[PDB]
Structure 1
Amino acid sequence: EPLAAGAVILRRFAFNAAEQLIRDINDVASQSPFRQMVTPGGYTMSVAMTNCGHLGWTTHRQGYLYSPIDPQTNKPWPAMPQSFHNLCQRAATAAGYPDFQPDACLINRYAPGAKLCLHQDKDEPDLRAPIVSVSLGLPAIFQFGGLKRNDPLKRLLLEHGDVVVWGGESRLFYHGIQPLKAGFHPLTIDCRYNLTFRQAG
């Protein structure tokens, strides 16, 4: 369990809820489809993304931001599914964050080779609130460091149903995903999904 101060991995926590979560990913994506976002610097991200809930993480020319509106559809992001919110609440409570109320869920899709380079989650104004991160499908190596980029990384395999929660002291810690290895999973076929819940408003 003990990843860092205020950080924990709940292994296979979402395993039982996974089938329903995956159906709801498909429902969300049918309204706001997965898209590979382009950085301010002009590079297309390997991870395909969408959002649900009140606020969605996005890139544009000027930087990163949380928007109530999907810039692709010009409609609000789909409502956060009850299955998402219920799972998130249970995970956060188990992790020691019983008062967490997310208003934002970023949905990441990793094809073979897709990565997410070391970054901080910092576009949220209320830093008191934790991050809840659900793994679905193919396994990936999760990097978890410290407050500085060059702080040593813990490398952890995240498997289908694993939930990682950080906050408090570890809230602004650098973290990332190494290039996804190809493979098969009975529920996702050829990809990894990640659900990242935050308080963005």
Structure 2
Amino acid sequence: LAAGAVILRRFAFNAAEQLIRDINDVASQSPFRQMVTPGGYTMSVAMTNCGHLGWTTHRQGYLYSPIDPQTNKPWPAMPQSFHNLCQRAATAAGYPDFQPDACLINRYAPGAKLSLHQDKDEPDLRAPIVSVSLGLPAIFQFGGLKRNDPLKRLLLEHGDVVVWGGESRLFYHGIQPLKAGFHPLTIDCRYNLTFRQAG
């Protein structure tokens, strides 16, 4: 399916309410914002981060920064719920040493999407990324190592966690425009957490 990826469906289902509380807490400090791409377009996905580092635009490029450029303060500390869930998932998937210092939190309103990309900016690409999906379902599309590799699609639903290791860590991937709907925990949106070793 995706070589090296370990899909754990509903792994975060029981933790989801706490996770969402923690997302709200994080956002009360560093608010969700829609970043501007180099190229000048406003992303449809809104973002924030927690942990020592967080992903952001700066100076018409992207990077991991210890300071949130919007507040000029550090990103909020990584919530225990986040840290512990990530560790359980990574450990089950065979990455017991994974120690994320960054968690990017993506929020999707109806229609929001994430264009096909690789995550290339972490210092060691042997370290996995761990995603946790919450709320409304989204169609995840994924390629291969080359931009033009044939795309496959799978639905990511509430509570689904995936550890993207091995070859899959390098795949081009994205999220297709979110279908509108209702979810009891998130109301009208989807959240996705991605845990990274950025330092």
Question: 1:108 Cα shift?
Answer: 0.4
Q: Runs of 4+ in structure 1 displaced over 4 angstroms?
A: none
Contact 1:40–1:60, Cα closer than 8 Å, also in 2: no
Mapped to 2, the partners of 1:67 and 1:190 lie a distance apart of 30
Question: 1:125 Cα shift?
Answer: 1.0
Matches within 5 A, 1:6-17: 6-17=4-15
> 1:123 aligned to 2:109?
no
Contact 2:181–2:188, Cα closer than 8 Å, also in 1: yes
Contact 1:39–1:61, Cα closer than 8 Å, also in 2: no
Q: Deviations over 1:12-33 (max 9, x none)?
A: 0000000000000000000000
Q: SS of 1:22's equivalent?
A: helix
Contact 2:5–2:164, Cα closer than 8 Å, also in 1: yes
Question: 1:69 Cα shift?
Answer: 0.2
Q: Deviations over 1:151-182 (max 9, x none)?
A: 11120001100011112222211110000000
Question: 1:126 Cα shift?
Answer: 1.3
Mapped to 1, the partners of 2:186 and 2:48 lie a distance apart of 17
Contact 1:38–1:60, Cα closer than 8 Å, also in 2: no
Listed as ranges, the gaps of 5+ residues in structure 1 are none
> 1:19 aligned to 2:12?
no
Contact 1:39–1:60, Cα closer than 8 Å, also in 2: no
70-79 vs 51-60, which moves further = 51-60
Question: 1:5 Cα shift?
Answer: 2.1
Q: Deviations over 1:66-99 (max 9, x none)?
A: 0000000000000000000000001111222111
Q: Deviations over 1:96-144 (max 9, x none)?
A: 2111110000000000000001100011111121000000000000012
Q: Deviations over 1:22-60 (max 9, x none)?
A: 000000000000000001111100000000001100113
Output the TM-score relative to the length of structure 2: 0.98
4-13 vs 68-77, which moves further = 4-13
Mapped to 2, the partners of 1:32 and 1:108 lie a distance apart of 13
47-56 vs 146-155, which moves further = 146-155
Matches within 5 A, 1:21-100: 21-100=19-98
Mapped to 1, the partners of 2:37 and 2:78 lie a distance apart of 25
Listed as ranges, the gaps of 5+ residues in structure 2 are none
112-121 vs 163-172, which moves further = 163-172
